[PDB]
Amino acid sequence: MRECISIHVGQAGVQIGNACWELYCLEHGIQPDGQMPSDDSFNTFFSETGAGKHVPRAVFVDLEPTVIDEVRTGTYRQLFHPEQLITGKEDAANNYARGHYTIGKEIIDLVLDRIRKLADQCTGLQGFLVFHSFGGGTGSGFTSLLMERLSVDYGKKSKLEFSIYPAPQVSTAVVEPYNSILTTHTTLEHSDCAFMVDNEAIYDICRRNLDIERPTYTNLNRLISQIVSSITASLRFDGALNVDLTEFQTNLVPYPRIHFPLATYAPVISAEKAYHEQLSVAEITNACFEPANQMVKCDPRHGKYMACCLLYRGDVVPKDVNAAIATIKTKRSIQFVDWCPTGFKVGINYQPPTVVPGGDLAKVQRAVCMLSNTTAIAEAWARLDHKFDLMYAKRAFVHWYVGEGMEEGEFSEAREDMAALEKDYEEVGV
Amino acid sequence: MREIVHIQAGQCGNQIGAKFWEVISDEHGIDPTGSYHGDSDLQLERINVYYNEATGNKYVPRAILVDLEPGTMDSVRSGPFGQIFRPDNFVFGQSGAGNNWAKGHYTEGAELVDSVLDVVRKESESCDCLQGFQLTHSLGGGTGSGMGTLLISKIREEYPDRIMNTFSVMPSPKVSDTVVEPYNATLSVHQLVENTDETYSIDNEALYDICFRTLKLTTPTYGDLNHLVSATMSGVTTCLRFPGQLNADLRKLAVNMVPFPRLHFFMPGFAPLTSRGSQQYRALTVPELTQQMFDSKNMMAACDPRHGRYLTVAAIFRGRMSMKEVDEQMLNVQNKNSSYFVEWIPNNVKTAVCDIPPRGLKMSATFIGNSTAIQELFKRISEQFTAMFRRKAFLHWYTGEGMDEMEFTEAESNMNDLVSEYQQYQDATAD
Amino acid sequence: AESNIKVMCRFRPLNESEVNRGDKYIAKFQGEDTVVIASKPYAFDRVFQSSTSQEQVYNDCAKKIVKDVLEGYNGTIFAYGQTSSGKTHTMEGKLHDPEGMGIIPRIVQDIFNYIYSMDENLEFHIKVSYFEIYLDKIRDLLDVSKTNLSVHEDKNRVPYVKGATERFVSSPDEVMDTIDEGKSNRHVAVTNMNEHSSRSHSIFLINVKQENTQTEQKLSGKLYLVDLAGSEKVSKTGAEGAVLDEAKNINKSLSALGNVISALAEGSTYVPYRDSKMTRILQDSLGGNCRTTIVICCSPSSYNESETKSTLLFGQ
Ligand SMILES: Nc1nc2c(ncn2[C@@H]2O[C@H](COP(=O)(O)OP(=O)(O)OP(=O)(O)O)[C@@H](O)[C@H]2O)c(=O)[nH]1
Ligand SMILES: Nc1nc2c(ncn2[C@@H]2O[C@H](COP(=O)(O)OP(=O)(O)O)[C@@H](O)[C@H]2O)c(=O)[nH]1
Secondary structure: OOOEEEEEEEEHHHHHHHHHHHHHHHHOOOOOOOOOOOOOOOOOEEEOOOOOOOOOOOOEEEOOOHHHHHHHHHOOOOOOOHHHOOOOOOOOOOOOHHHHHHHHHHHHHHHHHHHHHHHHOOOOOOEEEEEOOOOOHHHHHHHHHHHHHHHHOOOOOOEEEEEEEOOOOOOOOOOOOHHHHHHHOOOOOOOEEEEEEEHHHHHHHHHHOOOOOOOOHHHHHHOOOOOHHHHHHHHOOOOOOOHHHHHHHHHHHOOOOOOEEEEEEEOOOOOOHHOOOOOHHHHHHHHHHOHHHHHHHOOOOOOOEEEEEEEEOOHHHOOHHHHHHHHHHHHOOEEEEEOOOOOOOOEEOOOOOOOOOOOOOOOOOOOEEEEEEEOHHHHHHHHHHHHHHHHHHHOOHHHHHHHHHHOOHHHHHHHHHHHHHHHHHOOOOO | OOOOEEEEOOHHHEEEEHHHHHHHHHHHOOOOEOOOOOHHHHHHHHHOOOEEOOOOOEEEEEEEEEOOOOHHHHHHHHHHOOOHHHHHHHEOOOOOOOOOOHHHOOOOOOOOHHHHHHHHHHHOOOOOOEEEEEEEEEEOOOOHHHHHHHHHHHHHHHHHOOOEEEEEEOOOOOOOOOHHHHHHHHHHHHHHHHHOOOEEOOOHHHHHHHHHHHHOOOOHHHHHHHEEEEEEEHHHHHHHOOOOOOOOHHHHHHHOOOOOOOOEEEEEEOOOOOOOOOOOOOOOOEEEEEEHHHOOEEEEEOOOOOOOOEEEEEEEEEEEOOOHHHHHHHHHHHHHOOOOOOOOOOOOOEEEEEEOOOEOOEEEEOOOOOOOOHHHHHHHHHHHHHHHHOOOOOOOOOOOOOHHHHHHHHHHHHHHHHHHHHHHHHOOOOO | OOOEEEEEEEEEEHHHHHHHHOOOOOOOEEOEEEEEOOOEEEOOEEOOOOOOOHHHHHHHOOHHHHHHHHHHOOOEEEOOOOOOOOHHHHOOOOOOOOOOOOOHHHHHHHHHHHHHHHHOEEEEEEEEEEEEEEEOOEEEEEOOOOOOOEEOOOOOEEEEEEOOOOEEEEEEHHHHHHHHHEEEEEEOEOOOOOEEOOEEEEEEEEEEEEEEOOOOOOOOOOOEEEEEEEOOOHHHHHHHHHHHHHHHHHHHHHHHHHHHHHHHHHOOOOOOOOOOOHHHHHHHHHOEEEEEEEEEOOOOOOHHHHHHHHHHOOOO
């Protein structure tokens, strides 16, 4: 009804995109033939063209394609319409100068026109979901450019960002902070609200919480997707408030510069504990403040907490919801910062989570997504700070990025704004 | 981008290429006679990266084979890949330089490089999205050395905008037989360090050691050394050649691999280098392959890793596993082996993961590293170059064919700056 | 000396278009040394303000370079700046004007009046060569239709540009006429906004010989004046592929130059010279017996705000 365009770019942002849409297919009951089998009205994310064919508003953008091939030949080929599959040619993996400048130029219009077209075919536009690999080459070079565009082409509608900021361990580029710094400078101006994504906690969580061995990204995408899908469920599915994109923004980050929030989903558990015990609304909310269960593995113990927005999807009792939060808010010695006023913003939707036919979570009953902002993202920003200076003082890699299309000035500017952004997250006190 | 084009330069460049081709063929499910007798469409899909099409069922390798005197082309046409090569792409010639680099880059090769420039132009104009040239290059030969460099230079003059990726045979001063080699190698490097993008260095003694001691082949013949070069040339192309998990491209490796622009003398390595048998199974299961790959002497250039340090290291995994070791062991080996990895590059190891292993195998690894120990290899070449040059040796080779004293001196001075340069990043550190 | 590299910045005044249209004056001068440009300080050797004279500029900057080129060292002067930045006035000025003339006609003057001061013991023989780097290759600015030159290290291992026209120069007028044919043959590109856009770094080498008939010693004096192109954001200009090819080439070589000045300013381990073709030709000029002056040329207008910034941020 309120129509939300999901744009996903990068190796991972595409891949993860594909899993997002596969769980949205299953949640909404679309068969891979295109067909809804029974009477429901999920015209937010999907739309029925006239025959039994629910076409998403998924925009796959890529360089030399991987997943779009696997999509149009094989993986929900009869769901995804080829016009929305935007392939590319030339290369920029790592390279931000080739991304945001060279190859970005050759891309932009064919992509942008396709977006304006889907957004023509969205009548009651709610706004954008923009999924991208933040430190990535394939991802962020072009997506930072795309957001720069849609900030004018769309205007006042909001860009809901999911931003893969890398793990302190798992690091496929050497130049991932060079990407991310320049990417941040861009989203600092041209993004509306930015959900910083990890790898580490997420993998940590599959071993600790999920207790599968050491799974492939397919299952791990089925973790992320659970989390994106719960965020969107509150638009998708009927229930309390938290429909609008602005209902996050406004609630989470009312200080204008402080626009990266963090989040988590729960219950993430084993199929063993699924059989073995039944989790209560309190226990899932206690999992919402749990430090090990938090999405970016920045430390909630060393950190202090800011805003808190809780999305419950399942048959929950609003008294018990009021009590869970009341009690744990009253009880935990976590610092709720003196700049913020006191209070959570809660959201209770009828529809329970849905589980994938996979090798993943089991059929739990009640489920919650914690949205928060905490000072712990400054720790994330500390890795950037350390790591940047470590190459930059050296001037390593600069022959690849300034040599091939970037200007060197741009590196310092972003260094200064990112640093002022750490001063922003340090303006979090009294 | 899409199409890599392949160039075989030198009698070995030919051989190691033709084996590479043998491998990649067998990999995409093409018969070395001609037909796609293949099963997997996923393994069919990205063929145009190396192959040209033809009559539908046959696929033509987009090779340019360079050899000065005849006979090498006759050997490859004779060979079991033979008919899979299209006879236009046999770029043979008549008269010879015979190892002599000056004779090669200046004198003889001039007639042929118009020819080759024609052929590579033709195949490059043949392409959709031209990616790069991957040149198998006998670094200290004559056909590879002086002609292959003369070609690289024409190629660079023509295409700055494409990836000049060389696989460059430069054996040690221990097993080598080519006499004037120390001249040919300095002159060749003086062009390469100016000209080429990524030069993946290779040593026949290291290949010999791998075969004989690590793997335990009885007699390490050439095609055996080819088995390992072809595997790592197959390795490094893997991820763009097949769909996998993560990234693809060789530039995505290279952008990470080179910290300052002249540090482009790479050291590949392969695994499993296990002796052919039953335990085997208690040599390596899956995580343990990474423990093998990260190990000392597995490397296509024989750099003792206690002797230098590493800059960027990357790893191409082939097989249906997780980044479990890429999480776990890449952490733990950078923690424990902290001495090895230079601490100025924030997390040094750069892994990709492709689903397709080598045909019949289950898990393989390709190491691709920038080892600061590579400069010892250069140091001795520069020594021997100093020795010969200081002796004034081989005038009735080089200077006769018109090599200049300033360009001798320059190439030396460039090579020593290359030594000083690779050595400074050995020395170099964090705070 | 060698160690004390003169990083100077020279702001032009506002122009009648900038004054009437009203892009404002950015700078907040802390001093002789230091300026505040838009929040951030930038400290240098000398910030010449928009109220400074050509004579004050030249004498503080250029005049000692020439004496030192003459007396036993060589010298470098670098001029960095974009189109309309005020680079024309700084590096050349206008020769008929005895106020208005800049770095090149004042060096031609003090060189040739060093000639006309001394007598017939030194045998003064100036040779000049003029060459641009354009799309990697070295074009001769004097003689037309070459591909590339060879920049050979000699027995002293110093770079000589082989293939170039050397002009055995005899009059200060001849020096000058040279520049004019040179500059005419340049690869400048004309767009609709950007008319004299410099797409080449250009090196002018004045090889002053002065070999003594008396003392027999081989007295010399290489002055390199390097005309540095301006650093270009293709997000800014929005250009095409062929114009981007140029702009990356500029940006690369510029940035590589700052890495040697940074490594020179550090007094580091390797101190590179080899990788950039410019730093290759200027191997000894960067790192040798060179007294080196970097003259930065900026607008104080709010049009060119991130350009000034990007440029000033050079000096590390
Ligand atoms: N959760 C998740 N992580 C992934 C997956 N695929 C890759 N990653 C990783 O998470 C980060 C995402 O970056 P990428 O998407 O790989 O960066 P990219 O945009 O492909 O950048 P390039 O490789 O430089 O082109 C990388 O460190 C990856 O190794 C996936 O499907 N899911
Ligand atoms: N790895 C490998 N080395 C070989 C092979 N055949 C010869 N060699 C050696 O590797 C180098 C090849 O030189 P060559 O190709 O003859 O140089 P060219 O003179 O330029 O043709 C020599 O030092 C050979 O001994 C082979 O098939 N593989």
